[PDB]
């Protein structure tokens, strides 16, 4: 091995260990705020919601980055809190924590300790209600909050939850919109489980003020990027087809899939540009189809065939790699059934294989050797995977993951491999399943190992995951709980926390300050360019029509990086190509084919569809820009939706 | 206290028999496979989606010598491996059948089996025409037949015990047996299941697959309970799903009555035996709780048993627990008014329901609410409680309950602790700190417990006075993350086996413990005392009457450390009990307030007729408010009265064709 490294003693005297005696129940901790040094450690109860039950939860605060921690129980004197809820941390920088509780012997509401100053001062303020799930921040404000009671009473605080309002008695489900819009789902005589399909979606604007009704028949709903989704019931027939709105719920149009029927539709994500839709196989079958809109929701089509789903809960491996833009990674059924991994770099348009990982001489089978990533789907079907793929936005091209090879023993114990280029390439780094958190916009990964016996070692990577060292921060293994790693763009302070076995909790607090004491240099960087699938120079490094040069330490580095991974420069415009087109409505690409063909069964068939009300029909080359795709010059393939005279039914909800 | 220092680890030690086994990877089951057999299966399975195709070797031994020796025969089941999912499909009881359902290691057009009909010591292979998407099921009449499900949802049935298979219907859901070789299955032609719901048709095949009967359409679930065939259908317009019953494996139905205005709420059948079906009512609102009803013996005609009882939300368990060990007794978890949980105990199924009364030597004295004993069962297992098992009883076991116990403190319900029963719930006392996995063997001579943590661990805590007593032995030097805990089968079984790993590459071990020695006495007469069921009717004239009938029961002294080779239950003919409020389930209408050993009419109801709708036909009901529980053989004493009058018009009780 060329990674080379007496860094030991630059961790020892930056291991700071604290013992919380005569601890009962699960033991959160949390930083709290960039830069900071406010840590909360909080004991928690599992206790039905319905159940009065007698108990003290435990509160702890450092407020100097983990090396002490006060115990100021007193604060929440008489009440305790549930597992489920936890803490109610608020945006990065607000300073706002929220520690919903109840009374020890029991009230008529809940009590909630309000803190907007990294929870150093908190307030007591008690609730005119018993919460039935977590308080929601505002996304535009955090001063606005709104709560679900156990009686189904939505309640929303305009000052931080000092005082509550009750804004309607009969509500299902709430969620924020934008600008501080409300929706949720009512109903009337009966119970949310009795009346799926027959719900109300309403609106409010005022916080509760006035409100509109701009869905019936509503099965469920939900929101993703710039796009409000909701299940209408149409038919008796039970059928439920999906209706996309576009201006916070005043005109609907529902999806327009090409070839329809009775099939079973999911939204994997949307952002504001477009939508990932599954849609099951008619029978169930375990796999169904990812389908992609256009930039109003609306049109979709094929992406992804044979996509993989648990039976119960509807969970896939769809994966999007925040650490660049345009990729994403899910798992698909072959055609030998066997499980592959599938990879995009154009956000939908083009999904490849993912490559096998180098190195990996393993050579008795082609579905063998083959890289599997595991995600939600293999969490679902009970698989031994303690996190799902991780990566963060500052950390370009970084993503950590497990993985495993088509031997039975490798989906039993997966390993954790790495890629430093969005998921184009990928290494096995580490033996065994681990949980595992990026800090330091990637200049630390730090990974622990998931197994039934105490653990004593980090295993950490300064240079982007390339090499890998472990520290021993103790010499009393400890049962693993939790790793949170501390706020911010340049944090270097992880905390471990776990207990001996009554046990005994104990938190570790490790600062790689010293470690990365040597500032990085131009020789520690190199540069590179994001994967394109389509050939030449020309092209290499575009993503979704724009040119970028990343940046990335070498391989051995140890020294902290001041500067954004991604070049704060000109971004060039591409040309286009076919990886800068979505196939269009109708059309699909098959196995490893770059050019869309249209569907077998609508061949000598006119393709149409409803876009709000109006029949459109579709002339096409079989090509659609994807959205958002800046490309400018090359690739120009045209398409024309013209309207008709006919009128058709896109809306089933008013 | 509890014995004098008795002298066991030499007597354990030479009985403790240990197997080391080498490289194994995935989930490790073990099964004892007969009684005094002998035969020991220890199977290697993994997680596995079912329509993927995985290269996997499943790992296979086998005992012959009640696991002091394991033999590697992985060599019969080589190139192929076996999901987590499907484990083993032992047969009924003394019928010798085991079948490994497994699938191919490089893929095939079908799965394949190993069958067994000696008790696992000798199997043959046999290919199937499909892939099961669920274990098979042994038809209880004949274990040499067989059902299963496709991966293709195409219903399977053999009659030669797995070794020909044919298809006799390609669309079906859901099948189960019935009596006599009856298969009952779901199915639709318009799509998939999930898809079909409250469409589904109800069939039913008396032939193997011959001829069938449609006996039920607009169905969205069936099952089986007792001599009860129920389905849920889903009537017309609003969308409101009904529980029918038949009794006629499905010729004719009734819908379910019950007390109440049609609310919309969803209905669940807790259990049922010859007799009746208890049935779970959610209060409209979804609010956690709900009503307990008791059916009459036609499974029709219900009435109020128990006020809030508690079930989880997403998933609908409950605390609802058979006390096997003594007929007629079921304990429950409800809410108070006050919102604290409570156990309560019924002595005559559902009759009546009393308060679990607290342990004597109590950890104490809205803070009178604490100290009560809640029982954990599936309600807090689907809460996610620390109760890595629910309330174990054993019919042969008479009166022994062991069962994990929470008082209303915030931690003793994070940490429960082990209680143990020797009268059927009656009386409870805690015996063991924290969780723990326990087993009963021995017919109740031998309890084994062991602790449930994250530690490794090598201590067995045992018992050979039904729980009053408690040793705890050091089985091995080297502790082990625990994974089983496995009684031989037999009403005189005194081997366990106890299998786990070390070091989470896993290094796995089975310890065999034989209490033979600890039980080289046999008992005499001066070793049991005599007990008598409790009844909730005061008087020794009904002391230790169940359902109406009087029984002496057997149960060891405390300390008693001896081989009991005689039944629990002393007298050869039950005595016939007189009659009292305990013998009757209030009438339709009716129900009993809290504590109250008398029924009085629901309040919403008194001023109006009691009329329900019975196969077709309108009846009046009138009634003092008492109706016989159903089984209950009790004669002479209380006769409350009651008249079902036929009204002479029709009602709709038949929402299916
Ligand atoms: C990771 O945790 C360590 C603690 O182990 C943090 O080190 C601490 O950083 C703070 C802020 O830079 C230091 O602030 C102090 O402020 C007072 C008041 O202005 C001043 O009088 C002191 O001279 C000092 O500047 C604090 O001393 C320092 N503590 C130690 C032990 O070095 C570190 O900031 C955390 N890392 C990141 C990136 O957040
Ligand atoms: C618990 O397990 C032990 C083994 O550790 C069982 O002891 C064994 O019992 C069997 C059957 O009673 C004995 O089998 C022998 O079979 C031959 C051939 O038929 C026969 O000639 C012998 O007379 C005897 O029956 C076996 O020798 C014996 N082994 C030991 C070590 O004691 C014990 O039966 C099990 N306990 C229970 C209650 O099942
Ligand atoms: C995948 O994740 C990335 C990063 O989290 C998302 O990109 C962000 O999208 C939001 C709007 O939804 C923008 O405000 C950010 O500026 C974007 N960041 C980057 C780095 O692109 C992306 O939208 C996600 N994809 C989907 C389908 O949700
Ligand atoms: C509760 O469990 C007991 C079993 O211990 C069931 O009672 C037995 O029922 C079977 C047939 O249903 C009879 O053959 C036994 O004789 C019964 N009792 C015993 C052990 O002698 C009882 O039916 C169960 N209750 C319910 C509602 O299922
Ligand atoms: C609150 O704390 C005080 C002492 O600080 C204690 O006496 C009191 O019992 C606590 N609250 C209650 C009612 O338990
Ligand atoms: C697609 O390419 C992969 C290799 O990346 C190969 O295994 C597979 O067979 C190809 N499929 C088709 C239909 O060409
Ligand atoms: C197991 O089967 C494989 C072929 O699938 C064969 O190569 C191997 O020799 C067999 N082993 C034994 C011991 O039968
Ligand atoms: C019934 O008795 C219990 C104690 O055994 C008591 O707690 C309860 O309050 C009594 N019922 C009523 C209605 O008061
Ligand atoms: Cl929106
Ligand atoms: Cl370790």
Same mark, same amino acid.
């Given at each position: 091995?060329?990674?080379?490294?007496?860094?030991?003693?630059?961790?020892?005297?930056?291991?700071?260990?604290?013992?919380?005696?005569?601890?009962?129940?699960?033991?959160?901790?949390?930083?709290?705020?960039?830069?900071?040094?406010?840590?909360?450690?909080?004991?928690?109860?599992?206790?039905?919601?319905?159940?009065?039950?007698? +108990?003290?939860?435990? &509160?702890? #605060?450092?407020? =100097?980055? %983990? !090396?002490? /921690? @006060?115990? $100021?129980?007193?604060? *929440?004197?008489?009440?305790?809190?549930?597992?489920?809820?936890?803490?109610?941390?608020?945006?990065?920088?607000?300073?706002?924590?929220?520690?919903?509780?109840?009374?020890?012997?029991?009230?008529?509401?809940?009590?909630?300790?309000?803190?907007?100053?990294?929870?150093?001062?908190?307030?007591?303020?008690?609730?005119?209600?018993?919460?039935?799930?977590?308080?929601?921040?505002?996304?535009?404000?955090?001063?606005?909050?709104?709560?679900?009671?156990?009686?189904?009473?939505?309640?929303?605080?305009?000052?931080?939850?000092?005082?509550?309002?009750?804004?309607?008695?009969?509500?299902?489900?709430?969620?924020?919109?934008?600008?501080?819009?409300?929706?949720?789902?009512?109903?009337?005589?009966?119970?949310?489980?009795?009346?799926? +399909?027959?719900?109300? &979606?309403? #609106?409010?604007? =005022?916080? %509760? !003020?006035? /409100? @509109?009704? $701009?869905?019936?028949? *509503?099965?469920?709903?939900?929101?993703?990027?710039?796009?409000?989704?909701?299940?209408?019931?149409?038919?008796?027939?039970?059928?439920?087809?999906?209706?996309?709105?576009?201006?916070?719920?005043?005109?609907?149009?529902?999806?327009?899939?090409?070839?329809?029927?009775?099939?079973?539709?999911?939204?994997?994500?949307?952002?504001?540009?477009?939508?990932?839709?599954?849609?099951?196989?008619?029978?169930?079958?375990?796999?169904?189809?990812?389908?992609?809109?256009?930039?109003?929701?609306?049109?979709?089509?094929?992406?992804?065939?044979?996509?993989?789903?648990?039976?119960?809960?509807?969970?896939?491996?769809?994966?999007?790699?925040?650490?660049?833009?345009?990729?994403?990674?899910?798992?698909?059924?072959?055609?030998?059934?066997?499980?592959?991994?599938?990879?995009?770099?154009?956000?939908?348009?083009?999904?490849?294989?993912?490559?096998?990982?180098?190195?990996?001489?393993?050579?008795?089978?082609?579905?063998?050797?083959?890289?599997?990533?595991?995600?939600?789907?293999?969490?679902?079907?009970?698989?031994?995977?303690?996190?799902?793929?991780?990566?963060?936005?500052?950390?370009?091209?970084?993503?950590?993951?497990?993985?495993?090879?088509?031997?039975?023993?490798?989906?039993?114990?997966?390993?954790?491999?790495?890629?430093?280029?969005?998921?184009?390439?990928?290494?096995?780094?580490?033996?065994?399943?681990?949980?595992?958190?990026?800090?330091?916009?990637?200049?630390?990964?730090?990974?622990?190992?998931?197994?039934?016996?105490?653990?004593?070692?980090?295993?950490?990577?300064?240079?982007?995951?390339?090499?890998?060292?472990?520290?021993?921060?103790?010499?009393?293994?400890?049962?693993?709980?939790?790793?949170?790693?501390?706020?911010?763009?340049?944090?270097?302070?992880?905390?471990?926390?776990?207990?001996?076995?009554?046990?005994?909790?104990?938190?570790?607090?490790?600062?790689?300050?010293?470690?990365?004491?040597?500032?990085?240099?131009?020789?520690?960087?190199?540069?590179?360019?994001?994967?394109?699938?389509?050939?030449?120079?020309?092209?290499?490094?575009?993503?979704?029509?724009?040119?970028?040069?990343?940046?990335?330490?070498?391989?051995?580095?140890?020294?902290?990086?001041?500067?954004?991974?991604?070049?704060?420069?000109?971004?060039?415009?591409?040309?286009?190509?076919?990886?800068?087109?979505?196939?269009?409505?109708?059309?699909?690409?098959?196995?490893?084919?770059?050019?869309?063909?249209?569907?077998?069964?609508?061949?000598?068939?006119?393709?149409?569809?409803?876009?709000?009300?109006?029949?459109?029909?579709?002339?096409?080359?079989?090509?659609?820009?994807?959205?958002?795709?800046?490309?400018?010059?090359?690739?120009?393939?045209?398409?024309?939706?013209?309207?008709?005279?006919?009128?058709?039914?896109?809306?089933?909800?008013?």
């Amino acid at each position: 091995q060329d990674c080379g490294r007496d860094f030991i003693a630059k961790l020892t005297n930056n291991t700071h260990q604290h013992v919380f005696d005569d601890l009962s129940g699960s033991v959160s901790l949390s930083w709290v705020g960039d830069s900071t040094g406010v840590i909360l450690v909080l004991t928690t109860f599992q206790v039905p919601l319905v159940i009065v039950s007698f +108990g003290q939860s435990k &509160l702890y #605060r450092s407020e =100097d980055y %983990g !090396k002490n /921690f @006060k115990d $100021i129980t007193n604060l *929440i004197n008489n009440t305790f809190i549930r597992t489920e809820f936890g803490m109610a941390i608020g945006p990065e920088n607000s300073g706002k924590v929220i520690l919903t509780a109840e009374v020890s012997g029991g009230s008529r509401g809940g009590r909630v300790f309000r803190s907007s100053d990294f929870a150093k001062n908190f307030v007591q303020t008690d609730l005119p209600f018993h919460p039935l799930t977590q308080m929601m921040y505002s996304p535009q404000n955090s001063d606005y909050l709104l709560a679900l009671s156990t009686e189904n009473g939505l309640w929303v605080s305009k000052n931080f939850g000092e005082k509550w309002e009750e804004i309607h008695k009969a509500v299902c489900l709430a969620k924020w919109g934008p600008n501080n819009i409300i929706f949720f789902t009512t109903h009337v005589n009966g119970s949310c489980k009795a009346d799926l +399909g027959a719900l109300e &979606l309403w #609106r409010t604007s =005022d916080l %509760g !003020k006035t /409100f @509109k009704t $701009i869905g019936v028949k *509503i099965y469920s709903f939900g929101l993703g990027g710039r796009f409000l989704f909701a299940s209408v019931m149409a038919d008796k027939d039970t059928t439920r087809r999906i209706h996309v709105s576009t201006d916070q719920g005043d005109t609907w149009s529902m999806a327009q899939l090409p070839s329809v029927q009775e099939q079973f539709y999911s939204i994997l994500a949307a952002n504001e540009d477009m939508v990932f839709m599954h849609v099951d196989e008619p029978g169930d079958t375990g796999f169904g189809t990812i389908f992609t809109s256009d930039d109003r929701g609306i049109v979709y089509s094929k992406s992804l065939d044979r996509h993989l789903y648990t039976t119960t809960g509807g969970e896939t491996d769809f994966t999007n790699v925040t650490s660049l833009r345009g990729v994403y990674i899910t798992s698909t059924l072959s055609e030998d059934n066997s499980i592959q991994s599938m990879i995009t770099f154009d956000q939908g348009g083009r999904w490849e294989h993912l490559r096998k990982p180098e190195n990996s001489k393993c050579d008795k089978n082609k579905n063998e050797c083959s890289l599997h990533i595991h995600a939600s789907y293999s969490i679902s079907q009970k698989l031994n995977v303690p996190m799902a793929p991780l990566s963060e936005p500052n950390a370009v091209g970084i993503v950590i993951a497990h993985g495993s090879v088509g031997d039975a023993i490798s989906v039993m114990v997966p390993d954790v491999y790495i890629s430093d280029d969005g998921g184009y390439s990928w290494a096995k780094m580490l033996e065994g399943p681990h949980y595992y958190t990026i800090l330091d916009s990637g200049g630390i990964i730090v990974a622990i190992e998931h197994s039934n016996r105490p653990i004593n070692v980090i295993k950490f990577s300064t240079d982007e995951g390339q090499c890998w060292q472990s520290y021993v921060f103790t010499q009393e293994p400890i049962y693993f709980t939790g790793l949170a790693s501390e706020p911010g763009a340049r944090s270097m302070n992880i905390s471990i926390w776990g207990f001996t076995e009554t046990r005994q909790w104990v938190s570790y607090t490790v600062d790689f300050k010293d470690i990365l004491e040597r500032n990085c240099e131009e020789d520690d960087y190199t540069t590179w360019l994001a994967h394109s699938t389509d050939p030449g120079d020309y092209k290499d490094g575009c993503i979704l029509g724009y040119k970028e040069q990343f940046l990335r330490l070498r391989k051995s580095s140890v020294c902290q990086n001041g500067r954004d991974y991604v070049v704060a420069k000109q971004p060039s415009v591409c040309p286009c190509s076919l990886e800068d087109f979505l196939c269009d409505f109708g059309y699909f690409r098959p196995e490893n084919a770059s050019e869309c063909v249209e569907q077998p069964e609508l061949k000598g068939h006119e393709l149409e569809f409803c876009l709000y009300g109006k029949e459109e029909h579709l002339t096409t080359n079989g090509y659609r820009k994807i959205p958002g795709d800046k490309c400018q010059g090359g690739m120009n393939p045209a398409r024309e939706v013209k309207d008709l005279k006919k009128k058709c039914t896109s809306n089933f909800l008013n």
